[PDB]
Design a protein around this ligand. Structure first.
Ligand SMILES: CCCCCCCC/C=C\CCCCCCCC(=O)OC[C@H](O)CO
Ligand SMILES: CCCCCCCC/C=C\CCCCCCCC(=O)OC[C@H](O)CO
Ligand SMILES: CCCCCCCC/C=C\CCCCCCCC(=O)OC[C@H](O)CO
Ligand SMILES: CCCCCCCC/C=C\CCCCCCCC(=O)OC[C@H](O)CO
Ligand SMILES: CCCCCCCC/C=C\CCCCCCCC(=O)OC[C@H](O)CO
Ligand SMILES: CCCCCCCC/C=C\CCCCCCCC(=O)OC[C@H](O)CO
Ligand SMILES: CCCCCCCC/C=C\CCCCCCCC(=O)OC[C@H](O)CO
Ligand SMILES: CCCCCCCC/C=C\CCCCCCCC(=O)OC[C@H](O)CO
Ligand SMILES: CCCCCCCC/C=C\CCCCCCCC(=O)OC[C@H](O)CO
Ligand SMILES: CCCCCCCC/C=C\CCCCCCCC(=O)OC[C@H](O)CO
Ligand SMILES: CCCCCCCC/C=C\CCCCCCCC(=O)OC[C@H](O)CO
Length: 503
């Protein structure tokens, strides 16, 4: 028989890479089940170290093929030779692949026999703990979670109840039973798998929200398409400010809310006071509000400058003040982009090399929703929208819309900005709120309360997306409880499965 560990590692690579087809650009949702079926079936009847090796290679295919878009960021930021960046991409993919090896290795140790307890009970619970660590250890990088591939799929109804991680759970469960049915040539796990998969379908029709048409507003989002910063001089700041203002001016009397993307204003907040105070007056005059990203350096009590990635509000119902509490400061910073890991390497800084000291500061985990024109917006900047629990914790029942401002000009023309967009849609469906995503170039859109794309403008263009958005009010089960029910389910599955293994 050709079942040999060399073959299994080769197939793990292909079934892992197959998982990339499930996500935003390709959107083949059944690829998630086939992907997880390979991981489930290939680890059958293996030593714990052989299984861990197969789990690693599955993760290497998935993350190698689907996360490789980070290269362009490493290339332009890191300042490294070409093959060094390639090595660093292989490094990152390997790091994430560890958690998949850990999953397979632990699963094979406690549940070596190929049984429905292994695939249906132990696997989903362990996968939950595994995938939790991947997105937690260090800052965490929970990219490529197959739950997001169901945003338009049959399992979308599960999301507003138990959240996206419940779709991760059920998919690992259903894929496990199918791998068992195939390997053991037994139709019974197939029937259960189909039933477990089909039952959540009617839930996609439940509306846990209700719209508020009397609050319908016309919202505008300016896609500035301002290029990467090659030279910062007052000539580029004046060009940027002109582009954004000139696009906002004709909308001042019509659109109740105007949004500019992440770090849209390319100068410090303290250096723009005349501009902003004058812009706040013009908006209040015509009865409009502006929400724009800006980089804000702020003197601490210690008299040291703390630089924030901010969101500031202007206009009607949001009078601009540098001391205003109506602002959002980014919390979760990109590990190598916005801060430096291991700041304690300051010893080689002064003697020998020129080491980066440049690092952003973090805002609070919980922040009140931005108010503009009497509209409540719970903001998340860029990467932060992929963090399900953080967005839910900040979410308030009076929130009218979810707000994301991002700058994806890096990773442009790649799968990355789409995978990012796909996870932003998940937030709207989970919380039953419209989501307003204004970016610099990549994927400016409006997403309804069920995750449907309401309006969208093409990438890499200089445009304004103006459309009517009506807010929603009610509370979903996930918005109340969060992922506590899933962790309760995961505990009961792990309790049973470990108790069964220990007997
Ligand atoms: C086996 C199918 C694997 C396809 C891999 C894929 O999805 O292609 C993504 C591409 O590598 C992104 O640059
Ligand atoms: C890191 C994992 C790289 C894949 C090789 C692991 C390996 O060869 O182990 C297979 C098995 O343990 C040998 O019979
Ligand atoms: C199928 C195996 C997929 C594994 C692919 C892993 C290779 C790592 C990689 O994709 O790096 C390429 C580089 O980043 C290009 O921009
Ligand atoms: C030992 C590893 C320590 C890693 C810390 C060194 C990383 C340096 C860094 O993060 O800077 C990257 C920046 O994008 C380019 O200037
Ligand atoms: C140029 C940078 C390269 C950086 C290199 C470090 C991946 C392991 C694997 O899957 O290979 C197993 C093989 O298929 C079994 O024959
Ligand atoms: C030891 C029983 C507990 C199992 C817990 C495992 C946890 C491993 C997690 C990640 C490592 C993934 C990297 C894969 C490296 C394994 C390859 C290997 O070492 O296999 C060589 C084998 O000894 C040749 O016969
Ligand atoms: C014995 C084996 C249990 C080991 C680890 C369980 C760790 C899971 C407990 C972590 C609690 C979840 C959490 O605090 O993080 C929330 C996260 O953002 C959303 O899942
Ligand atoms: C996040 C919400 C998703 C959670 C969903 C909760 C569903 C759990 C219910 C039952 C477990 C399924 C176990 C079914 C076992 C399959 C039947 C089977 O395999 O029996 C044939 C056997 O091979 C011959 O001995
Ligand atoms: C998708 C692949 C799913 C594979 C499920 C195969 C189930 C099967 O082979 O059924 C056995 C047969 O019914 C016994 O008489
Ligand atoms: C799949 C299991 C989900 C079954 C549907 C349960 C719906 C539910 O949780 O009830 C909501 C209640 O009104 C609390 O607000
Ligand atoms: C002996 C080897 C053991 C191997 C283990 C494999 C199976 C793991 C099973 C269950 C993990 C239990 C974790 C459950 C903890 C519940 C966490 C919780 O209360 O939720 C936090 C909250 O929801 C945040 O927002």
């Amino acid at each position: 028989l050709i079942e040999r560990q060399r073959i299994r590692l080769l197939l793990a690579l292909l079934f892992g890479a197959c998982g990339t087809l499930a996500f935003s650009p390709y959107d083949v949702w059944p690829a998630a089940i086939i992907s997880l079926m390979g991981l489930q079936a290939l680890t059958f009847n293996r030593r714990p170290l052989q299984s861990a090796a197969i789990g690693f290679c599955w993760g290497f295919g998935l993350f190698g093929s689907g996360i490789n878009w980070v290269y362009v960021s490493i290339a332009t930021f890191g300042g490294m030779p070409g093959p060094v960046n390639i090595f660093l991409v292989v490094l990152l993919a390997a790091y994430l692949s560890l958690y998949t090896g850990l999953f397979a290795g632990v699963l094979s140790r406690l549940w070596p026999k190929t049984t429905w307890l292994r695939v249906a009970i132990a696997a989903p619970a362990l996968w939950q703990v595994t995938e939790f660590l991947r997105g937690w250890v260090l800052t965490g990088f929970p990219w490529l979670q197959f739950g997001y591939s169901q945003i338009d799929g049959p399992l979308k109804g599960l999301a507003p109840i138990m959240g996206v991680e419940a779709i991760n759970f059920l998919l690992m469960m259903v894929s496990g039973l199918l791998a068992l049915a195939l390997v053991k040539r037994n139709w019974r796990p197939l029937v259960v798998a189909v039933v477990l998969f089909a039952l959540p379908f009617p839930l996609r029709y439940i509306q846990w929200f209700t719209p508020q048409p009397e609050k319908t507003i016309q919202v505008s989002m300016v896609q500035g398409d301002i290029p990467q910063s090659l030279k910062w001089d007052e000539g580029q700041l004046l060009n940027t400010l002109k582009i954004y203002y000139n696009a906002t001016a004709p909308l001042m009397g019509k659109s109740s809310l105007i949004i500019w993307p992440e770090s849209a204003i390319t100068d410090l907040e303290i250096n723009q006071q005349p501009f902003l105070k004058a812009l706040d007056g013009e908006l209040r005059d015509k009865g409009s509000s502006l929400v724009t990203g800006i980089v804000d350096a702020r003197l601490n009590k210690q008299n040291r400058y703390d630089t924030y990635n901010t969101i500031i509000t202007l206009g009607k119902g949001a009078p601009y003040s540098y001391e205003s509490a109506d602002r959002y400061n980014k919390n979760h910073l990109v590990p190598f982009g916005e801060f430096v890991p291991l700041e304690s390497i300051l010893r080689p800084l002064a003697p020998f090399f020129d080491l980066p000291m440049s690092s952003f500061s973090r805002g609070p985990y919980i922040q009140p929703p931005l108010s503009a024109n009497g509209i409540e917006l719970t903001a998340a900047i860029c990467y932060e929208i992929i963090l399900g629990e953080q967005v839910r914790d900040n979410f308030r029942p009076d929130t009218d819309y979810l707000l994301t401002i991002s700058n994806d000009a890096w990773f442009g023309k790649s799968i990355g900005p789409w995978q990012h967009f796909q996870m932003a849609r998940m937030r709207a469906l989970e919380l039953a709120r419209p989501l307003l995503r204004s970016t610099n170039n990549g994927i400016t859109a409006v997403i309804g309360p069920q995750g449907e794309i309401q309006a969208m403008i093409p990438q890499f263009t200089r445009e304004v997306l103006t459309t009517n958005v009506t807010p929603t009010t009610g509370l979903t089960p996930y918005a109340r409880t969060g992922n506590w029910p899933l962790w309760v389910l995961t505990a009961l599955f792990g309790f049973a499965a470990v108790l069964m293994s220990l007997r």
